[PDB]
Amino acid sequence: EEVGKALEEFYPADNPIITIVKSGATGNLTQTRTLAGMKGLVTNPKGEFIPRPIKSSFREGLTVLEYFINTHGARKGLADTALRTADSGYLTRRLVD
């Protein structure tokens, strides 16, 4: 949180990476922090938090362990995005009925 704060402060307004965000064109400041700040905490395959955070950005480059433990929750997001559609479909069929 402090890093995202200091980062949206330190950045100028003529910067493109902040401009594309504050213009409403795309993106969030969470991504800008992940890129220029810190990725932060990541999930297990249970869905819990690993209390050892990723203090590295995708600018510094991530170490091997950090990348490995990010892959955990990076694979757990491809199924969720599918099961959610079946839940939505259930409720939508009910309402249309």
Partner: protein
């Protein structure tokens, strides 16, 4: 209590707890703010959002819960290191995360459950705070430090710190502390095996739930979620027939020689016709006879299955019997089908008589009736030949059966193990489950197929990660309740531990039902044999236990008496010196007051006596009751208040009490020695041994 230092301490502690609740409400505020923020946008991906939510929801829930009785008690160490113990961790984020409140599950919260006076860890004092919801009412100190007292200390240390995870007996007696010791032991035991517990459950047996008021002030996680209180008369899920005591018929229906009756009591219902109940059909002839009924009753008994279980075998045998007239009309059949298919009418009459059945099925219900276990007793007590027919004596007779006592509840339970169930009731629930699963299958049939995709690259669908059954299993109401409500609503429920206070008042069938509840045989039995009220009772632990736990059950008896003076102790020891005494008086010590008194009344000044007693009790900071029978006003017998200590008690009319029931001698012996300071007995003529 009643001290100024005491209120100064109360104020300090209430201030500390108020600060704790301040920090706790602040945390809840922060957590709800972050919760709503995360729910709203959160920026990140759905997995990170779900994680953050789930975590903050957990935190909130925990705080909401912890609002009720935060601090259990201080521990004052041997180095003045105040350790407040509660049900939540509260640290100072600024002062080196210095903890302000420990969790009851923390390694340095251990000398609140496993400490003693002989083997303390590093302590000098322990407390417990009496909390209503968040305000500190009172508090009870306990010095874990300070010959003869060392003996009590060592024995209590041995009972409490014991590692058996099995049956235990604490038959200490009066004035010696069986109760607090059993409480500390349950503390030890449910803090030490809280992983194997916490989901099996707990059961508590006794008149007063005030024993379950300890598990809730040191282990709230159970006293309001897991623990289940029952009384000998509540064992069944649906009735609390407690006041309905009974005379010595109990002994008969409270001892396993009644099991026989039960079996025979069903045999007296595996009835046969008095005369052939005619088959009321046109083109057949009655084959129903004591012949066929006899054949089929024997067949059903011969598979060793409960009644409602073998109903089916009985009916099938009777159908293959009537198959006789189905095909044995004169020689055989006599229809143009009986040259190749000898069974056209065989399995058109016999496979149609389950449809042309009302007569057949209803006149069958006489010889194999579907007994709901309440009726087998209703119409076993009213009748007069059923008692002898099934083996019962005639004392058991009674007009109204539904007027249920304490000694027919375990019988009612065993009936459910002796009878069985329908096995065909849940037939529409299958229909509804199938239709829900079909609706889910259709939900998935609606969704896009991997071969009809309009995306750039193939990806995971829901049709390859979930099926109709599980997709439907999550939109169900799936109601959930706490362990107590799950258990109390069930009889086949295996608990994890069973505490039994005043254990000498349970019939052999009660212990039987209990051990049917706890196979893990983890018991914390407390009781006394000389203070038994029921006539069934035990009179011996080996009689009740060696049938279930032979040679394994441990037994410990508290030896010394300190709580009750030795004057009252000699009074009630020479009272007990009657009716097979074999007196084992625990040696009382430290009696430094006025010896009891014994007052007389002429005809009716007993009213003035009790009036003065009551009006005076609340003039000295005392607390007690007045012991008597039901007819005298203001008096409450010990058959409703036995295991309670008191400062200054009175007992009216020892004689009518002594004679109101069989074992009045013990009901008096108890009442005499329940006073720490003052005793009072009222008489008119003379005393037998007082």
């Amino acid at each position: 209590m009643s001290g100024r230092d005491y209120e100064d301490e109360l104020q300090s502690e209430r201030d500390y707890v108020a600060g704790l609740y301040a920090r706790l409400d602040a945390e809840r505020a922060q957590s709800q703010r972050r919760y709503a923020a995360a729910l709203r946008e959160h920026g990140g991906t759905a997995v990170e959002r779900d994680a953050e939510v789930r975590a903050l929801a957990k935190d909130i829930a925990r705080l909401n819960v912890a609002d009720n009785g935060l601090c259990f008690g201080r521990l004052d160490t041997l180095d003045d290191a105040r350790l407040y113990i509660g049900r939540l961790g509260i640290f100072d984020r600024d002062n080196d995360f210095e903890p302000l409140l420990l969790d009851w599950r923390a390694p340095m919260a251990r000398p609140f459950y496993v400490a003693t006076a002989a083997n303390p860890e590093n302590m000098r004092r322990r407390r417990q705070f009496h909390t209503l919801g968040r305000k500190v009412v009172d508090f009870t100190d306990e010095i874990l430090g300070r010959d003869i007292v060392a003996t009590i200390q060592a024995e209590q240390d041995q009972v409490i710190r014991l590692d058996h995870t099995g049956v235990l007996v604490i038959e200490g007696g009066p004035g010696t502390g069986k109760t607090v010791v059993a409480l500390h032991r349950v503390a030890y035991l449910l803090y030490t095996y809280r992983k194997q517990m916490e989901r099996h459950g707990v059961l508590v047996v006794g008149p007063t739930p005030a024993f379950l008021d300890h598990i809730g002030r040191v282990l709230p996680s159970l006293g309001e979620s897991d623990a289940v209180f029952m009384t000998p008369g509540d064992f069944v899920p649906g009735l609390h027939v407690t006041a309905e005591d009974t005379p010595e018929a109990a002994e008969v229906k409270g001892s396993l020689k009644i099991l026989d009756v039960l079996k025979a009591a069903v045999a007296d219902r595996q009835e046969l016709p008095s005369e052939p109940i005619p088959i009321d059909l046109s083109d057949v002839t009655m084959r129903i006879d004591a012949e066929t009924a006899k054949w089929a009753r024997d067949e059903a008994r011969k598979t060793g299955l409960p009644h409602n279980e073998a109903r089916a075998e009985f009916v099938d045998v009777v159908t293959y019997v009537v198959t006789e007239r189905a095909v044995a009309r004169i020689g055989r059949g006599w229809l143009t089908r009986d040259d190749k298919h000898a069974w056209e009418k065989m399995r058109a009459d016999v496979v149609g008589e389950l449809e042309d059945h009302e007569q057949f099925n209803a006149a069958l219900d006489a010889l194999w009736p579907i007994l709901t276990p309440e009726d087998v007793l209703a119409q076993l007590y009213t009748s007069h030949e059923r008692l002898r027919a099934a083996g019962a004596p005639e004392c058991l007779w009674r007009a109204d059966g539904e007027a249920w006592t304490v000694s027919d509840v375990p019988l009612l339970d065993e009936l459910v193990d002796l009878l069985g169930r329908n096995k065909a009731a849940d037939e529409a629930a299958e229909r509804e489950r199938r239709e829900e699963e079909a609706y889910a299958a259709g939900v998935l049939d609606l969704m896009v197929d991997r071969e009809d995709l309009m995306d750039d690259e193939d990806h995971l669908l829901a049709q390859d990660l979930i099926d109709a059954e599980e997709l439907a299993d999550r939109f169900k109401e799936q109601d959930n309740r706490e362990l107590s409500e799950r258990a109390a609503a069930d009889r086949e429920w295996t608990y994890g531990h069973v505490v039994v206070d005043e254990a000498q008042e349970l019939s052999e069938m009660d212990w039987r039902l209990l051990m049917r509840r706890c196979p893990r045989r983890s018991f914390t039995i407390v009781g006394d044999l000389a203070q038994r009220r029921s006539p069934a009772g035990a009179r011996s632990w080996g009689a009740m236990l060696d049938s279930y736990v032979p040679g394994r059950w441990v037994y410990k008896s508290l030896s010394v008496n300190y709580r009750t003076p030795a004057e009252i102790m000699a009074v009630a020891a020479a009272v007990l010196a009657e009716f097979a005494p074999d007196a084992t008086p625990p040696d009382s010590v430290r009696a430094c007051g006025v010896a009891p008194w014994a007052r007389q009344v002429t005809d009716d000044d007993i009213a003035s006596a009790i009036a003065e007693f009551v009006s005076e009790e609340a003039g000295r900071e005392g607390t007690s009751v007045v012991i008597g029978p039901p007819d005298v006003p203001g008096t409450v017998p010990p058959s409703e208040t036995k295991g309670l200590e008191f400062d200054a008690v009175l007992v009216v009319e020892p004689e009518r009490i002594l004679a109101d029931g069989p074992r009045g001698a013990a009901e008096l012996y108890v009442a005499l020695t329940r006073a720490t300071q003052r005793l009072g007995v009222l008489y008119r003529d003379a005393l037998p041994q007082a």
